[PDB]
A paper describes a structure:
On the other hand, the S179ECL2A mutant exhibits improved G-protein-coupling (Emax 25.78 vs. 64.95, EC50 259 ± 125 nM vs. 9.90 ± 1.42 nM for WT vs. S179ECL2A) but a reduction in βarr recruitment (Emax 1.61 vs. 1.47, EC50 32.0 ± 4.90 nM vs. 305 ± 65 nM for WT vs. S179ECL2A).
The Hydroxycarboxylic acid receptor 2 (HCA2), also known as the niacin receptor or GPR109A, is a prototypical GPCR that plays a central role in the inhibition of lipolytic and atherogenic activities. Upon activation by agonists, GPR109A couples to Gαi sub-family of heterotrimeric G-proteins leading to lowering of cAMP response. The comparison of the ligand binding pocket in all five structures reveals that R1113.36 forms the most important residue for binding to the negatively charged carboxyl group of ligands, niacin, acipimox, MK6892, GSK256073 and MMF through hydrogen bond.
Residue numbers in the entry:
A (entry chain R): 8 to 304
B (entry chain H): 1 to 72, 76 to 120, 135 to 248
C (entry chain G): 7 to 62
D (entry chain B): 3 to 340
E (entry chain A): 6 to 55, 183 to 230, 245 to 354
Amino acid sequence: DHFLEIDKKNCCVFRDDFIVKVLPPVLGLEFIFGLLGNGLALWIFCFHLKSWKSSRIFLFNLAVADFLLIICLPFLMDNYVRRWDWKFGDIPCRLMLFMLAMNRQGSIIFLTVVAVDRYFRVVHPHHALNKISNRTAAIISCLLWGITIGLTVHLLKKKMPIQNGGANLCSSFSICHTFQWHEAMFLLEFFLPLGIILFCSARIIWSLRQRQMDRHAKIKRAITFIMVVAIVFVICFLPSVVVRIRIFWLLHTSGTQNCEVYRSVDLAFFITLSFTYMNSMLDPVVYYFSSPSFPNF
Amino acid sequence: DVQLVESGGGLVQPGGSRKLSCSASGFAFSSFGMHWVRQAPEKGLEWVAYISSGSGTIYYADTVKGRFTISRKNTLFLQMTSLRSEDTAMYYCVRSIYYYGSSPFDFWGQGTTLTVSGSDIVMTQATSSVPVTPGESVSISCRSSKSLLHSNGNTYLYWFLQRPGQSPQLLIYRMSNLASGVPDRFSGSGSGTAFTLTISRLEAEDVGVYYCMQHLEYPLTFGAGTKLELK
Amino acid sequence: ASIAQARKLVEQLKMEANIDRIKVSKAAADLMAYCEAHAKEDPLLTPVPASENPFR
Amino acid sequence: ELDQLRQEAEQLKNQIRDARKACADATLSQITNNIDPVGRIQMRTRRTLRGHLAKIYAMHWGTDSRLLVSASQDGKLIIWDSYTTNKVHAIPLRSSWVMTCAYAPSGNYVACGGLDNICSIYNLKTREGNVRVSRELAGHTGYLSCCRFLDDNQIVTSSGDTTCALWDIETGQQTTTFTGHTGDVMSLSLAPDTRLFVSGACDASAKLWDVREGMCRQTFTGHESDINAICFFPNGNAFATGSDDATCRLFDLRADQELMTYSHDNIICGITSVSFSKSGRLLLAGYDDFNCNVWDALKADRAGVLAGHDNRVSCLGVTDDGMAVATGSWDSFLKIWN
Amino acid sequence: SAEERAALERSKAIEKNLKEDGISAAKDVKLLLLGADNSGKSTIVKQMKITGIVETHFTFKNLHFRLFDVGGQRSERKKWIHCFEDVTAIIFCVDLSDHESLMLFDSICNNKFFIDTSIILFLNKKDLFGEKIKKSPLTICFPEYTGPNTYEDAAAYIQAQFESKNRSPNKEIYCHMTCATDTNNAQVIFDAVTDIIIANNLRGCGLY
Ligand SMILES: O=C(O)c1cccnc1
């Protein structure tokens, strides 16, 4: 709970008392809530469904990204129980940080692409994008995975764990001055996808409104679900990004010369970072509560 | 009726260049693959170039690759550059279409005379000419350096008849099948590596030069030709 | 209308009723005899091996 | 007057029933009880003919067992080389609403028809290299459900105006017409020697016709609902028909009656084709339930299942040498089983 | 492979032509057109211009509408109606100036192939119906009618008597009342089809 020198810069980290008392319980809740929903969603997509359209392709990719995110979680449960004494060592640390970052990035990409898909399916129904083949969707999918992978592959290159005191830290989100691209990633992956999500949702809602078919019960279903996906995205990601903004505000205005300023807000950061896992645990909204198929199964 | 007509013959200066053109009518040209074949002034046929349907693939003979070029409005072209003394011949435009049961090389244009101022399958015809008279029966035979009976079961030998002063007519294809419009007097025979056309009850209409040919792989090889000659 | 149509129907029924009919024992037994005589020439009921099969 | 004709027709039917019942000394299932069952008939999808874009409604094999024609409501009739899966021809129909097609025994021609009422005779061996309509046969008052060549010059058609007809393809005219069903003549099959043929009708009867004498020679009944498909047993002395009543039956020509019935309690979908194997020992039936079932045509029990389609099978056919059994369905993929 | 590769080139070329035809045809919208005998079908076909099936077609706001009048078939529907399982919508015409149409609607709109396919319902000849109600009451066609004999209510009652016949809950019956002089029918068909297409897309997205 003091300070660090790493990456040629002053950084800080805090093994505060509350973290083991709150975070591993919450994160285990995310792990079970995520697996019990998302794994069954993959099961349904593989055996219960029997054909594909581009929409279903992107929904399957969303489920896969969430599955890998969920697969991350138990290590991190152990990591927080160990008070960031990372037992599993170098290779597990690097691959875990890589995957987990990539899975946030990728689940966000497939949320965004599902929203764009809905926009073109409802606002411009005759447009060519709505009639693309499954192979076309597959190559689009592999390019989407490509950017989500390559934009964070460096976490396999960076050294870890980082050792100080009685601990060996396997983490990226330590406080410090160097704005490595990981921070730009974590910020823009909220704000730009938020822009696309809200634009697409607003235009879908408006097109169904002005068409005066908003009166029907199943169109009311569609309208409400369009909006709850956006609200879920906001509540899952915004509390974490605002805390990162506060970390940078404190670093700008006061520096690291008194790092005891940062203890409770760092604890809060990791608490709210568990929300970003909640976005994966709350994925049933995108496949179960809508459709006839999922209530039928 | 089906018709192919070519233009662009005459004398050329050696080392020069010439374009020969083939004009096709009466058939769905786009769906055929078109060949060029050339006959030296007193000798058997030799193959020159091929261009498939949709111009997907193009092939040339060993003595021609890069010196000529084949391209295809119902018109086909052969563009010739650096014409050697050896390149004088009558050039025939030959159609062909490929699918199960099809009959390649089945129609031959009338042809233009142009004149100027080791792994390939070799083929031999054992007799240069056979004396024969109407009502008799005759046999013409052919052999290859590599076996033509392919794994898919076909044996790719083709037989042609050139009556004096005509472009060749296809008589037998894939070593057994009789070409449409050919009298039943003809028959193919033999298998593997040696082949035989049998003519039963020969007639004056059958007097001419017979060429066997392999189509197993390019470059296509014609036999030296056997003249079934009257009396 | 109906007189001619019914005349055609009864003419057909009577002309057809005269057909000779064999006993079902024979009519079934020689179907069995056919099936058993050509069981040696049916690739679908006895599986054809991959060396002889053209649909490899 | 009329009442007497009705009563006499009724008595004629009671004499038919008496004669047919008198001949039923034993049943096929009883006679063939001692025959060894054909066992579990396992089969695998050796080929899948991808390339149609809408529901397939018909298929037919060339006499060489290698070429096959398949036609769909996309408006294409395509000829396939089954050994390599290559497409040999693709024929653009003058109308997209095909319901039937056939491949001539010589291989020279392909025929096709449907909701147009017209039946079109394509010539595959044209000197011009492309494939063109040699004759458009017209004259039915309803959709043509099914047609077959007797030989290159004459084709028999079956139609929704209760009528089959025999055409001279040179003149394009009906050489004979076969009136006599109470409903659509939904399906047809010429016998091995082509001297006579049967047609299954939407009045649930199947009738036996003579193509030279032009008259109905026998009438078979026993289904509760429309007969969707039919064909002869390879010996030519029996035939089998499949109804929308979710069952197939085997009828005998000389005993004038149904010999056996193929059904199971778990089956409720209608048949869409019923075709024998070369020995006659297997009857393969395609069902609306997306499945296809193989029946031991003597023992009358399930030999196996040809399950590979995402939508109903519209057609089925065994090659002339018995080496494979194709199927084609509404999910637009033909598949070869062996 | 010998000259068995040129055959493969032909195979790929006509596979290319098959796909190129198919992707061009998939742009068209297919519409089965129906009604009882002499129920005004031909008039909306005529407004849009251009013994078996009779395909009309027209083009509007970049959609190509293929408009199948199938009623020429002198045979029972059950054995060919499964051809039209793939249409985007069913257009059903009723002549208000005429009742068999109502039984026909009851029969088709609940048919096993069409429980998922929506109907566009044109009540043709509204003007002549206004004339008729002025001289002979609607009770002649509906003895149970319990309401005023005036166009604005009798006509809506007929509309309700039709719309009451669909028993599956996966479809909507897009009504319209046509005075037979209107040029607007193309727009009515078009935007009904747009609603139908976005509903199909919402189903395909699992959002509905
Ligand atoms: O979720 C993450 O990216 C994460 C978790 C713990 C430590 N560093 C990063």
